[PDB]
């Protein structure tokens, strides 16, 4: 009885926080500040999820009844939550089934894509920082104004430590390992390009796909030279185009991850709302 009102308040708390999170994700450019806010909102959602998980265990073992009408509301719950109403399951089971749905959506959807977005964002921010410093490695060169001199080795090392830094940082899961079949199944449902399956000791992991940065490093290797190379403006333009093309690729990959994260919020929002309606009807 008191649990219900506590749970209903906890559920609305989760709804507002979720909406604040969605505003953070619709922003054009995710900054370090943006990631910090996203992190806070997520830890708040987990705080109320645990609070909810304990109130539902109470309702489950007490066998608080969810009346016919109230159960039918659950049919509006998102298909991802795997909540249907009524048919034949006890009050104990339904309360537990609701707690699992909240926790599973938060653990397998929210937290997962919140980490993926965080990982790829941090990498892209460091990548964009290298591109911002690109003029530092470019010099006039030839005395006619038709050439430019590129510090190929410096720029090469800069991109290679970028790769070294995120070479291991996984997209999914944030820490643990996963079976080959499941790591592939998470990658196949992501978009193939963003991530790569890699064996992290006893198990597997979906790690950041470094092909965009490997493509840039190979463009630099194909320039030759021994530290510095003189490029005519036409060749500089061609090379520079390749670099900006991979920036668009990674920008695109990041937008895809943020969309998966955004889609997860929509799932969670739909569930929490439906649960509030069901709670209010008991």
């Amino acid at each position, epitope marked *: 009885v008191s649990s219900l009102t506590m749970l209903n308040d906890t559920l609305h708390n989760i709804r507002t926080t979720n909406q604040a999170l969605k505003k953070e994700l619709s922003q054009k450019t995710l900054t370090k500040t943006s990631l910090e806010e996203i992190a806070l909102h997520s830890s708040q959602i987990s705080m109320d999820v645990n609070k909810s998980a304990q109130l539902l265990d109470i309702l489950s073992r007490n066998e608080y009844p969810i009346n016919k009408d109230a159960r039918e509301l659950l049919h509006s719950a998102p298909k991802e939550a795997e909540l249907d109403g009524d048919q034949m399951i006890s009050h104990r089971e339904l309360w537990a089934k609701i707690a699992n749905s909240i926790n599973d959506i938060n653990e397998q959807y929210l937290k997962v894509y919140e980490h993926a977005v965080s990982s790829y964002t941090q990498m892209y921010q460091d990548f*964009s920082a290298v*591109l*911002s*410093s*690109l*003029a530092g490695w*470019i*010099s*006039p*060169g030839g005395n*006619d*104004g*038709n*050439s*430019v001199k590129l510090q190929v080795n410096s720029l090469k090392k800069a991109l290679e430590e970028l790769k070294e830094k995120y070479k291991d940082k996984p997209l999914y899961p944030a820490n643990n390992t996963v079976s080959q079949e499941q790591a592939n199944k998470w990658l196949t449902e992501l978009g193939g390009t963003i991530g790569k399956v890699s064996q992290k000791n006893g198990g597997y992991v979906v790690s950041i796909n470094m092909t965009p940065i490997d493509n840039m490093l190979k463009s630099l290797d194909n320039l030759g030279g021994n530290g510095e190379v003189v490029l005519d*403006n*036409a060749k*500089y*333009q061609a090379w*520079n*185009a390749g*670099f*900006s093309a991979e*920036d668009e690729t990674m920008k695109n990959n990041l937008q895809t991850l943020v969309q998966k994260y955004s889609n997860a919020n929509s799932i969670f929002d739909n569930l929490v709302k439906v649960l509030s309606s069901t709670i209010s009807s008991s």
Partner: nanobody, 125 residues
Framework: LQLVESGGGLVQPGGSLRLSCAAS????????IAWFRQAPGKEREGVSC????????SYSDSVKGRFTISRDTANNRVHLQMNNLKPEDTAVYYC?????????????????????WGQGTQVTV
């Protein structure tokens, strides 16, 4: 296709000017933009530059801290806010477009890369 500067004129030491780069049949947003200046009998030098996305700005050594470059994508313009104008800055100021570069976070002051130039506006201190 025309690059076009404005905002010049005669000011005294410690004063300020706000140069503007505008264009016809040409969007300054499509490539990096730089400001050059040339005193009457000296070599043309670079002053500052701004990247395509506007989040990156560079300034020559003899200009840092005092000047500020920004983009006005709304009206398709680039501004150069020159503050505490010391007498050395007397020169014709040009804004130029580097059409070779396509990376959006970078900008250079290399004259050879800029092939679209404005007429220039006189500044005197």
């Amino acid at each position: 296709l025309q690059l076009v500067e404005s905002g010049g004129g005669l000011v005294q030491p410690g004063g300020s000017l706000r140069l503007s780069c505008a264009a016809s049949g040409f969007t300054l947003d499509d490539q990096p933009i730089a400001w050059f200046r040339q005193a009457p009998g000296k070599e043309r030098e670079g002053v500052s530059c701004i990247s395509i996305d506007g989040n990156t700005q560079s300034y020559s050594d003899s200009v840092k801290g005092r000047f500020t470059i920004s983009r006005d994508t709304a009206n398709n313009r680039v501004h150069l806010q020159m503050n505490n104008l010391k007498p050395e800055d007397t020169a014709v100021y040009y804004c130029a477009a580097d059409r070779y570069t396509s990376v959006r976070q970078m900008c250079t002051m290399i004259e050879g890369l800029h092939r679209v130039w404005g007429q220039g506006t006189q500044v005197t201190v």
